[PDB]
Design a protein around this ligand. Structure first.
Ligand SMILES: Cc1cn([C@H]2C[C@H](O)[C@@H](COP(=O)(O)OP(=O)(O)O)O2)c(=O)[nH]c1=O
Ligand SMILES: Cc1cn([C@H]2C[C@H](O)[C@@H](COP(=O)(O)OP(=O)(O)O)O2)c(=O)[nH]c1=O
Ligand SMILES: Cc1cn([C@H]2C[C@H](O)[C@@H](COP(=O)(O)OP(=O)(O)O)O2)c(=O)[nH]c1=O
Ligand SMILES: Cc1cn([C@H]2C[C@H](O)[C@@H](COP(=O)(O)OP(=O)(O)O)O2)c(=O)[nH]c1=O
Ligand code: NA
Ligand code: NA
Ligand code: NA
Ligand code: NA
Ligand code: NA
Lengths: 398, 397
């Protein structure tokens, strides 16, 4: 049978990849979003993927004319008109637990509002915005540390899983739907946040303010700013200044302390670039000092280089171990899919120091992984003619 | 002992009244809010009550020096310096379930936000706004139909009872405090709502839109408006218009139906004026046809006249009975505390017809009540020398 996948980012890519794997009998057509540049960024380009995999890319107007297909929307950017199809097998993943948080910026609004939870919802496309009947959902816990970016990445992951768990019933017409309730229904348009003019509001509680920081913390788009200085999270003090809300109590190199309606807050200056530079050659002890919010250790620059990737490229094995102890992914990837192991290989090759591989492997380092060109570390070693190092690396795999 | 009552409205008045009744020996001092107009309105004037009962009004600066008082803020308008008193018996009633909804407009924001409940909270005055340790608090249901005014009245009533239930522990220092949690706190300033520029936003869900209506419904202040027409509540329909949200789908003498993000909503035009006028003489069958939202029957005009009060003064007994069956208060009062019974008394004097009295008494009419000059219907009848009716009403007692 046939499926049209309409949308973007790792959710479209990964739903597609699964289909090519487990449903090879299925003709796939793609619709891409107007702003998919064709180049991989912090999310994969769906357009790139479809080109690289000979998946035909069509228009929505063309998709309307395909019979005996289902249609599946995944962060799609176009209004879909149900009457224009010759069927009603029209499905969307929305990044909320409907009926709450219809519309936009669902990575921010639940955080701003102090929600503990959100979700992803599979539903029918009807004539309105995220109004159609619910087929499946999955609740997501928002952790107190988590940013809008963390929550978006959870949406992407949980949304992928929910499709995968339901896509057979979508293909079989063996699914059940239920109309959305009136009660609790909520919606935010794009007018509700003006990302070109964000401003922290300190006439609020400390809880609210920290939730502002979190909601606006999505590095590839922006960081919250106080007085032009970029902030990466904050914490609540027990202190309660009688200075009017917004008054800056202290300023140092690492932080700004501000008066609120209730408890003082400390806003950490974003020092990610500096942290990343230190990852080349410093140890544990130095990095632990630079750090304020722990999750800053999992951020990435514009190439997708994290702390643990930089450490790997420079053979900083003591730091790699500490980072992984803190939550870092031993198999982290840049935006081309290049893995920690590949970067470590570069170090081994340069230094002639092979000795640290065993320890990384015991931390979970995976030599089988492929980048987005379908190459393993061994592909690169074969190409560069480094057969002895290739054999050496294979000898430690388990 | 002594207490300084700082604040306004029926909560200030009714806590004071209770203390004069039940704690004879407590000396009371008052601080009034600056905007207290000295005239009884939808809330009683605390300054008027203090003058009329010889409760001395003091300044804040004076209050700081009375070392042996406790201090109770009841919608007080001035920020205090806690450390400046030589005691720490400083208490406040806040109209939310703290630490949620610190600050202003707490009869609006919970409704707007889609909350099922709010609360009232008795707590210490400390550094922060509304940040002091909690002594006692109670949750309050917000019914799906209730307006900001309904919620406000509830905060006044539940706040008063919360103070009454705890006031002995406050004067005797036998209360327990628990510091407020950081988590879940929320706060809204005066700037969060411009009441001089309310606008309904139709780029929202039906649930959200009906909540806006409710939240902005507070007649003595304003009603929400569409196309300059005032609206008194609404409902959600089952249809889902394809038109862009905010599009007017239907318009008539009763109501306006509008498209939203999800379900269409009907906004009911405010016909309170019309209803109140017909309460003079029309019967329940006619008045029933006018009603778009049931709670309109408990609204009041600028003098505090409700449908039941107007019906009583015009001797409309058949209407009174139906109104009461719909949940009207048989002892409703205007803003001067004049009761239904006193209005019915006027009608009995003008008409010479006492035939309705027994039935209203059977429905709960209370002849013992006192207006805000502290007179009963009997006092009035004596003064007027209306000896016949006096005799008859007294026969019920
Ligand atoms: C547009 C924009 C979005 N965001 C946040 C809020 C969104 O929920 C989240 C993802 O938005 P977006 O990347 O537009 O993803 P989608 O198109 O799949 O919604 O990013 C920002 O932090 N800054 C921005 O400028
Ligand atoms: C991680 C890292 C890489 N590099 C080098 C290694 C690569 O040769 C080069 C290109 O970056 P990159 O975007 O990682 O491309 P690829 O996925 O092809 O590696 O940058 C540094 O110079 N410093 C670093 O910290
Ligand atoms: C000032 C104002 C308040 N309100 C509502 C929201 C407030 O929670 C409610 C009570 O406000 P107010 O009468 O100022 O009482 P308090 O000072 O005890 O809060 O009235 C309006 O609807 N319109 C208005 O213009
Ligand atoms: C209830 C009602 C009262 N009245 C009269 C009788 C009232 O005593 C008079 C003044 O009303 P009001 O100003 O409300 O003061 P009071 O406390 O004395 O009632 O108006 C009407 O004319 N029409 C009415 O519908
Ligand atoms: Na069709
Ligand atoms: Na916007
Ligand atoms: Na402060
Ligand atoms: Na205001
Ligand atoms: Na609509």
């Amino acid at each position: 049978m046939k499926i049209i996948i309409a949308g973007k980012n790792d959710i479209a890519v990964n739903v597609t990849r699964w289909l090519q794997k487990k449903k090879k009998n299925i003709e796939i057509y793609a619709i891409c979003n107007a702003n998919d540049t064709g180049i991989d960024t912090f999310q994969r380009s769906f357009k790139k993927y479809c080109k690289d995999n000979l998946i035909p890319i069509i228009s929505l107007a063309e998709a309307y004319k395909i019979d005996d297909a289902i249609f599946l929307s995944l962060e799609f950017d176009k209004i879909v008109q149900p009457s224009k199809f010759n069927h009603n097998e029209l499905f969307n993943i929305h990044f909320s637990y409907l009926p709450k948080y219809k519309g936009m910026y669902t990575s921010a609004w639940p955080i701003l509002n102090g929600e503990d939870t959100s979700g992803v919802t599979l539903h029918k496309i009807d004539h309105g915005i995220d109004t159609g009947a619910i087929i499946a959902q999955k609740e997501i816990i928002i952790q107190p540390f988590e940013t809008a970016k963390d929550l978006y990445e959870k949406y992407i992951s949980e949304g992928t899983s929910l499709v995968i768990d339901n896509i057979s019933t979508l293909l079989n017409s063996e699914y059940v739907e239920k109309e959305q309730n009136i009660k609790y229904s909520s919606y935010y348009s794009k007018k509700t946040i003006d990302y070109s003019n964000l401003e922290l509001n300190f006439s609020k509680t400390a809880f609210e303010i920290i939730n502002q920081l979190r909601a606006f913390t999505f590095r590839e788009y922006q960081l919250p700013k106080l007085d032009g200085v970029n902030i990466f999270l904050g914490d609540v003090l027990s202190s309660r200044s009688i200075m009017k809300p917004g008054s800056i109590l202290e300023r140092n190199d690492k932080e700004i302390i501000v008066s609120t309606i209730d408890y003082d807050v400390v806003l950490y200056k974003d020092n990610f670039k500096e942290i990343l530079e230190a990852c080349k050659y410093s140890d544990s002890k130095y990095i632990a000092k630079l750090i304020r919010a722990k999750s800053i250790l999992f951020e990435k620059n514009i190439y997708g280089w994290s702390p643990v990737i930089v450490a790997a490229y420079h053979g900083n094995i003591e730091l790699i171990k500490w980072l992984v102890s803190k939550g870092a992914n031993i198999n982290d990837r840049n935006y081309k899919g290049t893995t920690v192991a590949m970067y470590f290989k570069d170090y081994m090759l340069k230094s002639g120091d092979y000795s640290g591989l065993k320890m990384l492997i015991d931390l979970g380092l995976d030599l089988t992984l492929t980048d987005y060109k379908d190459y393993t570390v061994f592909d690169y070693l074969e190409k560069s003619g480094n057969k002895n190092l290739l054999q050496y690396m294979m000898a430690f795999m388990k």
